[PDB]
Amino acid sequence: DHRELIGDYSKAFLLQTVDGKHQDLKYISPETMVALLTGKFSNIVDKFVIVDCRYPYEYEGGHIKTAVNLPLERDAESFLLKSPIAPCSLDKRVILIFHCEFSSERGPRMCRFIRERDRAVNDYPSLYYPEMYILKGGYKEFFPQHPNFCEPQDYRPMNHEAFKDELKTFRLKTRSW
Numbered sequence: 001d002h003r004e005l006i007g008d009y010s011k012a013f014l015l016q017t018v019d020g021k022h023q024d025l026k027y028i029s030p031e032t033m034v035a036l037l038t039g040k041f042s043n044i045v046d047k048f049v050i051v052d053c054r055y056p057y058e059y060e061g062g063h064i065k066t067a068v069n070l071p072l073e074r075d076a077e078s079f080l081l082k083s084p085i086a087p088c089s090l091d092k093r094v095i096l097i098f099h100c101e102f103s104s105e106r107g108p109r110m111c112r113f114i115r116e117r118d119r120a121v122n123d124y125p126s127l128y129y130p131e132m133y134i135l136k137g138g139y140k141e142f143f144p145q146h147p148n149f150c151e152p153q154d155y156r157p158m159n160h161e162a163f164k165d166e167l168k169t170f171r172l173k174t175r176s177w
């Protein structure tokens with residue numbers, strides 16, 4: 001591999017990465033997303049969690065099969081760090097994939113946050129989650145290409161004109177603005 005090692009310096013990144021806006025983050029394409037969902041890496045990957053950082057209305061409107069919705073910092077901390085998700089095999093890996101609508105703001109921030117807490121609660125340089133990726137293009141790019149991997153087969157934009165009140169309500173739930 002021509003790149004650096006993963007978070008705890010144990011080995012290299014498994015997946016092929018593409019270029020994305022945040023230069024220090026690892027991005028994967030929708031194609032690689034379908035590869036994991038179809039079991040292409042089942043020999044090596046024990047578990048991969050898809051974290052959709054969108055607001056609840058957006059997720060309900062249609063999300064990638066198997067994804068979990070964790071919009072608030074607190075929920076994510078609770079789901080991932082209280083009782084970490086471990087591989088059933090010493091040999092196998094655990095991988096996290098974050099995404100939002102455009103994978104421009106929400107997703108990358110959540111990725112950076114979980115990394116901060118993973119570092120904070122372990123002895124350097126161990127991590128519960130050494131390998132994390134962003135799905136480049138977010139749900140917006142994913143739906144029109146692989147609709148049968150989405151449930152329901154539909155797409156609800158955050159700015160959806162009929163969910164204006166729900167957006168405001170939701171933001172008043174956030175740790176900070």
Ligand code: MMC
Nearest residue numbers: 111112115132
């Ligand atoms: C760093 Hg994610």
Ligand SMILES: [Cl-]
Nearest residue numbers: 072073174175
């Ligand atoms: Cl929050």
